[PDB]
Design a protein around this nucleic acid. Sequence first.
DNA 1: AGTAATCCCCTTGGCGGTTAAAACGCGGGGGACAGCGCGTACGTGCGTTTAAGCGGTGCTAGAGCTTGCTACGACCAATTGAGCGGCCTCGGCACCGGGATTCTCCA
Length: 60
Amino acid sequence: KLAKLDELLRELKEGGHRVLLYFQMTRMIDLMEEYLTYRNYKYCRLDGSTKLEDRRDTVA
DNA sequence: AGTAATCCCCTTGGCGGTTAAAACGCGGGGGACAGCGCGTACGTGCGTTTAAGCGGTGCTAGAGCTTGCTACGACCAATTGAGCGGCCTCGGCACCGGGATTCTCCA
């Protein structure tokens, strides 16, 4: 998945697309967040551990 | 019926500052501590006598155990209001300042 995601994210970013990724596991949000920091992608995160003001602002 | 995400809450950890409490220096005083002399008060030994300890005899109070039952507490279901959790407020206690009284110490 992460291989095919990395190809797809490259095709999308070269396309100028903007993307939402859904996870059933929040630990996969941690692992994915490492991969994103190890590449050029600016990103945001929401899950069930975030406080509500952080949800407000990250969506904004 | 199970296991994981979501979300509340409450505890731990960090950052800044501010200031009040801990640390540091130094003179001197007076209290700790070793030293001395005496004298009286406690340990010792003896002769005295006192009664604690032992072996023995006698009695009856009352500790200890069984029997019998009925009075009193355990248990349950229905009723209700006394007592708890939450919200409010105002008045008691603290906190400050300032002048008055007290206490301390060197003269």
